[PDB]
Write an enzyme that holds these catalytic residues in place. Structure first.
Site: not given
Lengths: 505, 496, 496, 505
Positions: B256, B290
């Site tokens: 990720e 993120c």
């Protein structure tokens, strides 16, 4: 110890007949760049046109265009295409099986079985076209809903090997098509004709269905063609079956399904039914001339019964009928090429050098009947330890026999190789069977009881662990690798959490 | 009024002690703990060498051989106990998160609560980990699919979620029968030490094996040794070299890798909802999630009013000490983060953009080593290079559209693919956005921003975000190996 | 040495008080609490009328209207809190279970631990309750399946598991958004009062609605009113009239109505394993489990040795006060249970059986109102009437076989279909027993007895056992309603 | 307002042709006990032989014999039978659709659609034959394994109604067969011929497959035949579609799947696309002459748009083409019988008595063109409140129009009836759509957005709540109702927990 082998010319005529019946235009595919061949005699059949790397890129872009329409075509409509294709496979089953025998050297009943596998995965995929299940689930947020949805991914690159020249593509294409993907297939340089026939049948189904023309394309070529396919930024998934592909695709943030070979063992315990075991072991070791990724290559036998098992396998290997794979009497057809035969002989020599005893087979049969072809009797080799030659897979019919005492030792012997595709245990003992399948038992992708290392079917996920590469194809929910997951939170409350309670108005 | 370094150091030491960390044992001269609140070094720490990483993997692998045969519900009891200890020490851990990551106290508390919540979810999973039973074509045979523990899991986490990412990985991995070796960010070692100490207490309470979880503190070379280990079958990395390196040795990865997340604002959007959601998603955590909102794709008919309202909001954002409850925006992590922000904003104005609000450094004299900045709002004429490549800073680029398919294309055009949202009152626009030809991201939401996610959902993204999923749904499958088992009870050979 | 009634009464009152019960509020003259340890009445209780049941359903339905829109993970927080309170009061609740059900202290503790374990499982479920998303044949449409809270759940439980059955139902129902009205056995009201008081504390701690769970104490007419309520869409009953009555008003039932469970003992069975497993499954809880082993189907080649070994074991079973840790077999619930046992054994000897061991009343002078009995072992020449109809008492009938298909037929021939087991070292016999033409029961096990079940498995049976499932896997679906939702976002009418 | 209707004789000839093409032996099924009929003219076609209750019991026992073989036949082999049957349905689609039109009175395109639904469920079931998924899961016990398995249940009794004379049986039989069950089907006394044709096609598939002969049987009779089927101790599952069955089956500890009718509403909000809405509402209200369990019977319209919606629906109902269902121009065919017409007229009279206004339709069309047949124009009735006549379903084309202001009021109006099959909302508002589908929204089994109350397809579970009966058929995992769950704990440890630590040795 003797056999009549079909002539190259008779083989060529049968190949041409099959191709024409499957709707291939021979004038259009013939050329002088590459050659179709047959392991039955070793000879070239006829020349073919090839694609260039530039043609691969053109094919991928056309497949992406098709994808842009297909991904919004309802999955059940996509399944109707796959149903039509299964109907055409059914109608041409014998023609396709002829091509499989011609190019891969498989016996007739195995070739028919491979084509039936294609028909079976089409049936399964038609069912999946109404499933492709995601989830709905609670959310912690009042006046919200949460779900998980699956969407079509894009163009799928399929790299297949010579040994299953039609079923591996079918597992990938039937599933990919119903998942709303499109496919570019690079078949083995050894088996183009089977691919051309498959593609022509699917193109007829496409035309009958009014589906987009670029749903599937075959790229015929050598290694530079495959590399261009692997490296494409428009190919989000590469499925490679039968080494460099994993890291190259990961480098461009693509996905792979890898199934890269197997060094498969079976454990024979003292309570094993020996008639069952010998029959199963012979099929699993000798079937397809030892050229399945699931072939049985190591037999781990309890010391109390090892002598008798070796005697029985020796006798069975000596009675194996080797010959033309079109003859109903034949159980072992040829190896694919000279290189394969050379590797087999080198392995058997090295095994006897590392302390082994050749018990049965290993010799080239009737070399003068088809001098360009390599018909060999499967080899049975007793080994005092699992040495380097036993751990390093040779794609040939060699069964190494190892002995054990404690079941945990058998399990360790199974597990200590770098490959992890399939494993089996032959036992009448309930606890041994369960211990083998337990988390501390066999470490492979496929672990079976009282069936050999080729015991798999469409409904199961197919693939392995460790250096086999981790991919799954075919059944269960392997289809998920052909789609992308979305997590969707839907707010119907009209409000949002205010950070530190502040309302920006 | 910014907290003093001495006060912060003392709070960090007290939190660590209360969480069970032995300060003497972890202190040293190789690495330093630091705080973005003032930019100051707190104190020195011992570091691990690459050889220590190999020893840690060995220890974790030894622990794995025991753990993998410990019944999953018994493994779940360990995680339930851990969750109880996290609950007991929630405030202490949250203080370390604020100190090292710079995030506001409420967000730090929320991150520790995510840990507790995934523990409770994993306790549930411990009785599920479901495979399948299914029919076989073969008479007198049975067929099933089972799931087995994989081995040692390497976890590489970032500064911005210094505890929750490891918890998503470790709670799940442990109930799956795996063990863990964690390499935390070199910016945030103290949070990891505290987490590890609390989990070691739980391990002791449960009588579980001691090697279930280990933390390796260090630089690049420690992380590299972990990634390259042949005994680490799964690497979970949050923060690009990892994927190919692990693939080369036939390991598995969960990746990720960042996000360049957009929201579409349609003409029927509720503007009060949209402005609040956008401000919180763009400015929250000083733009260092993120899932931060970096791109706002607004319909041309409302774009002027939306920009006006966001300008006013951005001008009013309270920036300051993250231990003060009045603060919404704490500091950036370090000087380099500030430099990169400024470089992006300069690039955007050179590419035809207009800075509408923000971007200036706040109260530099109050803490010269810390970088407090007002989030930037930049109107752009197109999605130019600077818009397409994310900067880990609070910058919100505003783009306009007319046709929804073009908003969708703008969303999808970037290399990242983590999250997306649509603000609309229109039923069909909402559905179009989520459709197979809609937004291409891993997370796609309606009337909630790009941080709209929760424990029960699979978390992660597509494209250059890396493809991994963590946390909810059946993300746990990445931590186990599937086996397909055919059992013959017929005494006969039936081939397929 | 049997505990005195005064000592028991005092222990019951202390447990109730510690669990939060207001003794003044629950005491009365309509019903009496009792104990099988001595047979004595403990004290009188207030009772509910049928009209009170209707008021309780109204209250539960009002609570449901709020609870059904409370997010499931928030509902799970309530159940997590309940589990914590059960953990805190495990000993107190277990004492009430021993007092009212007569079960040995270790089994009483185990039953309370089942409650705690299903709470932890339900906390997991609270983030799952999974439906599906799937493709539609219609262009520009989407299709899904969702699960919604059902309403008020009526729970009818028996004396023998006075707390765990309600917990399986209530933990699951509550996380599913339902509310509960519980009618416990008239033999075991105190355990229910204690459970309800602890859950009411959790409700208060969570700020949840007060009507989530209510207990109705009473006789037949209270249970009948609950069953017939038009506002009770699901009735869960453990203990036959219920199914048709509820079906008549288009409600749903979960029925688990008893068991006549068998195990098959093959010639390769490990006899030490088998004897231990059989003794514990036949004699445990004085033969008063739904899953009690009542029939042993033994291969003729080992039948004599098996009977010899069971005779010796049964002669050695320690019978006595269930608060003494030395005791394996506590008392039967009441005189009627003893009468029925004796009648069955008399019938079996009249049908050609031989009493091999047990059956006699133990120490009648030590507690004349209590019925302590030695489990009975009866060898039978065939599966006669008395074998086919279960008696809720410790009687183990031994039958012989030669061919496994005939053992399977003997297993399957009875009207009940709860659990079955096979003891064998043979891989193929084990698989045959579990195959589609093998044992027909809801639970079918290898080398573990008929009580071999756990929280993560769906629990229940087939045939006259009633078909219901509770506890694990996806049993939760019986507590919700499925909706199939097609969403058109195309603006056009496309017919299927 | 005028129409040419096929003659009874022409209808009979078409029925005979269809039956013979489907492989029915007319001499064998003809008799004088019962009669085949057609709603197109109201007339009897020809007499049929009937089964007695004793014959029902003989059929059930034969089906149980077949079950004893079929339950150990591998599910994928069972799916091959169902695949063959789907092929035969495909080949005879037009013939079967003729019978459906003849017996149920459906228009040609709806009859073809019903037969296609049969073909689609066969495709789905063929997919399911490799799934039928249970679970494997952890156990708390060391050295144990835990799984959940699904097994064939037994004979399934299927009770179907006149209105879907082939698809309801197909949903049940395709699924039941692949689940290893066998089927005894009691079709409506109004529609035997469709059943005979279906059964003859399946018997040919059975013969081609070499499957057991008693897998499916049709019992032709009146109510005593159905009752005997419901009451059988050898029938563990009764599926009844289109009232006493639930409690009678529960009394003998059997299982039921009940779908017993619907009183289905759609909500029309102020932002609804009115062209979409009117089209959808007309199809859903008037389709199949209002004789679907999913027919639209109540329209709940926001007060701001109610007048305009009523105007538009009035005009659309007035333009509906009513006539012979074999004519391509026809959209509304006849009601099934006189009793149906009588109930319709009684309801419309009662509605005007409870305060309603008849806006359009309700009259018998061209009575002299087919005096025994009841062709009626669908009725549109505006109602000031949801009175008893609105709450009590009439199986006829009557659309009651109610008004609302607040969406929660619309939801309450949807939910307050005793039935709970399907519901729809027409809206352009994202939040209204989601509120309708939320846990406090519409309470029905099927709840749709911007599609009417007949919006369902094979892949979804089909059925309803409340007095509809709770059953699910067709898609998702409705198949679980046709099987029994087993929870299996397997000990491979060789030991057991010792109670109080005592070892009896």
């Amino acid at each position: 110890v003797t056999a009549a082998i079909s002539g190259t010319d008779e083989i060529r005529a049968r190949a041409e007949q099959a191709l024409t019946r499957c709707g291939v235009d021979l004038t259009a595919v013939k050329g002088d760049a590459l050659t179709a061949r047959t392991p039955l005699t070793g000879a070239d059949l006829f020349g073919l046109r090839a694609q260039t790397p530039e043609d691969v890129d053109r094919a991928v872009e056309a497949a992406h265009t098709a994808f842009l329409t297909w991904r919004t075509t309802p999955a059940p409509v996509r399944g109707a295409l796959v149903k039509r294709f299964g109907e055409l496979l059914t109608e041409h089953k014998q023609d396709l099986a002829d091509l499989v025998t011609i190019e891969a050297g498989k016996i007739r009943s195995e070739a028919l079985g491979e084509v039936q596998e294609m028909i079976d995965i089409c049936d399964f995929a038609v069912g999946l076209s109404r499933q492709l299940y995601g989830r709905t689930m609670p959310t912690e947020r009042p006046g919200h809903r949460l779900m998980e949805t699956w969407h079509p991914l894009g163009v799928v690159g399929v790299i297949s090997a010579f040994n299953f020249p039609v079923a591996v593509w079918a597992w990938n294409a039937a599933v990919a098509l119903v998942c709303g993907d499109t496919v570019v297939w690079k078949p083995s340089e050894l088996t183009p004709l089977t691919a051309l026939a498959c593609a022509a049948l699917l193109d007829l189904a496409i035309a009958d269905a009014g589906a987009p023309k670029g749903l599937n394309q075959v790229v015929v070529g050598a290694a530079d063609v495959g590399e261009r396919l692997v490296d494409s930024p428009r190919v989000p998934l590469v499925s490679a079956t039968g080494r460099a592909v994993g890291p190259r695709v990961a480098a461009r943030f693509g996905r792979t399904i890898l199934e890269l070979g197997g060094n498969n063992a079976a454990v024979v315990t003292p309570s094993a039914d020996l008639d069952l075991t010998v029959n199963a072991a012979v099929f699993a070791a000798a079937g397809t001339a030892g050229q399945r990724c699931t072939t049985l290559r190591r037999l781990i036998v309890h010391e109390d019964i090892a002598d008798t098992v070796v005697e029985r396998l020796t006798a069975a290997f000596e009675r194996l009928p080797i010959g033309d794979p079109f003859q109903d009497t034949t159980l072992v057809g040829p190896l694919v090429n000279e290189a394969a035969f050379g590797r087999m002989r080198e392995a058997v020599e090295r095994a006897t050098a590392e302390g082994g005893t050749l018990c049965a087979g290993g010799e080239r049969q009737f070399p003068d009947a088809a001098p360009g072809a390599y018909y060999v009797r499967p080899a049975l080799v007793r080994m005092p330890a699992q040495t380097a030659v036993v751990r390093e897979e040779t794609f040939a019919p060699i069964l190494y026999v190892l002995t054990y005492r404690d079941l945990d030792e058998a399990i360790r012997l199974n597990n200590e190789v770098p490959q992890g595709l399939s494993a089996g245990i032959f036992t009448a003992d309930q606890s041994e069977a369960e211990r083998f399948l337990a988390p501390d038992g066999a470490d492979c992708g496929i672990a079976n009881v009282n069936i050999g290392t080729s015991g798999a079917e469409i409904g199961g996920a197919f693939g392995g662990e460790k250096e086999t590469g981790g991919g799954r194809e075919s059944g269960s929910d392997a289809w998920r690798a052909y789609m992308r997951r979305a997590t969707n939170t839907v707010n119907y409350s009209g409000r949002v959490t205010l950070a530190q309670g502040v309302d920006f108005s």
